[PDB]
């Protein structure tokens, strides 16, 4: 008696979105619960058909002191290729040409569908922009994870913090900031979403296998391909921070604090000059918390009339925006 977890829009949707006193659409429109993110990035196509090569180098040693006659020998600098992969992802929706016309006019219906699908899409793309990489591909980021160096390169790009626990992964969030121009690569078609197409044909119906099918519908889909670059391991910053015990203790107090906010900034320049912009990322919660705690510095402030400090968008200045990280991850910092 029904058997399945409902793929396709059962009448429950068309009766919740509904139409009363007429009409066409929902009073522009329906709103609410999906978080917001930035990125809002820079995109590039990459030679060749994938990868992107580039090289960097692994040490340039070493000259030795000549002792008037003998020791020299030829010397040789080396390098190594690098760049990585990417992948596509997409969905698609279906309706029944009949039900979408009862009641009349499906245009508003489908428009609602594509807008909602859009918000969920961006939600997922930012959701996996920071985590993952040990599954069936696209893509990779987290690869700054290890705490100390010598087992990797980490170290200077990680700045880091203390605390958390080795036997309890609860909870403490994390903050990032890095510069754009270390781009995001895409295969040779436009950038993001692009959907943006239209089809009206026939099912595509009853599965396994499925003793028939056949019905007409009105449908389409939305695809997306992307792939970040590393280009250089540096101009990036990680933290471990709180947790909420000290995060609450830090009202104005100083035991486990926000000091790293400066360290990370100063951990950059070689150069390696590149290129034009930089930006700091927060996960909300730490955003407001940083504001509230920064107001009460016994030192540089004094304001005028009056508080509370008109957001943060500076420091120093390098404008900061907000994304959606999470409040629980793992340790792995300084040492």
């Amino acid at each position: 008696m029904a058997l399945i977890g409902q793929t396709l829009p059962s009448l429950l949707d068309i009766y919740n979105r509904t139409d009363k006193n007429g009409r066409i659409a929902r009073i522009v429109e329906q709103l609410a619960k999906t978080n917001d993110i930035l990125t809002d990035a820079i995109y590039v196509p990459c030679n060749d058909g994938s990868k992107h090569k580039t090289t960097i180098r692994a040490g340039i040693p070493e000259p030795v002191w000549r002792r008037y006659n003998q020791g020299v020998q030829p010397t040789k600098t080396q390098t190594v290729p690098v760049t990585d992969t990417t992948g596509m992802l997409y969905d698609l929706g279906f309706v029944d040409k009949a039900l979408a016309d009862r009641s009349n006019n499906a245009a508003a219906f489908r428009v609602s569908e594509n807008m909602g699908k859009l918000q969920g899409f961006n939600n997922k793309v930012a959701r996996y922009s920071i985590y993952g990489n040990t599954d069936a591909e696209p893509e990779a980021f987290m690869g700054l994870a290890p705490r100390f160096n010598t087992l990797s390169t980490s170290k200077a790009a990680s700045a880091e913090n203390v605390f958390s626990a080795g036997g309890s992964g609860s909870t403490n969030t994390s903050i990032w900031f890095m510069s754009w121009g270390e781009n995001t690569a895409h295969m040779i078609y436009p950038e993001g979403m692009v959907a943006g197409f239209q089809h009206e044909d026939l099912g595509d119906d009853l599965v396994s296998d499925g003793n028939g099918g056949q019905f007409r519908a009105y449908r389409d889909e939305f695809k997306w391909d992307i792939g970040l670059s590393v280009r250089d391991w540096r101009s990036i910053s990680r933290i471990c921070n709180i947790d909420v015990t000290t995060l609450t203790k830090d009202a104005s107090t100083g035991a486990d604090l926000i000091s790293m906010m400066v360290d990370a900034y100063y951990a950059r320049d070689v150069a390696m000059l590149g290129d034009g912009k930089e930006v700091i990322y927060a996960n909300k919660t730490i955003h407001a918390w940083l504001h509230k705690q920064a107001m009460n510095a016994k030192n540089v402030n004094l304001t005028i009339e009056e508080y509370g400090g008109k957001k943060i968008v500076s420091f120093l200045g390098i404008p900061i925006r907000r994304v959606d990280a999470i409040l629980n991850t793992e340790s792995a910092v300084t040492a």
Partner: protein, 111 residues
Amino acid sequence: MKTVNMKTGTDSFVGEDGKPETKDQYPWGLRITLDNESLQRLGLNAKSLPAVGDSVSVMAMANVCSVSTRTTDHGEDNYVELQITDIGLAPQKRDDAKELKDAFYPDGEDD
């Protein structure tokens, strides 16, 4: 009308309920406005009553339920607040009957 959700029959035999089978009616939502339905044809003997319940994916929590007696062809009405799973119906009980349950969605009525 319509596929997804329920379909007949079960068929509500002698001595068992009909909590089966729909997995799943999905697990996130709430419900307060529109309609449902339920009825079938031939019965046999005496007292029967449906019900509903829900939880997260399996079992078991609150209910609503109803009561009826012997007759052929009927129908009541809707539901109040629920989380989401709706394992319903959950019919009962005794005597000796072996045929046909119901299904839900729009009217209905009479002429």
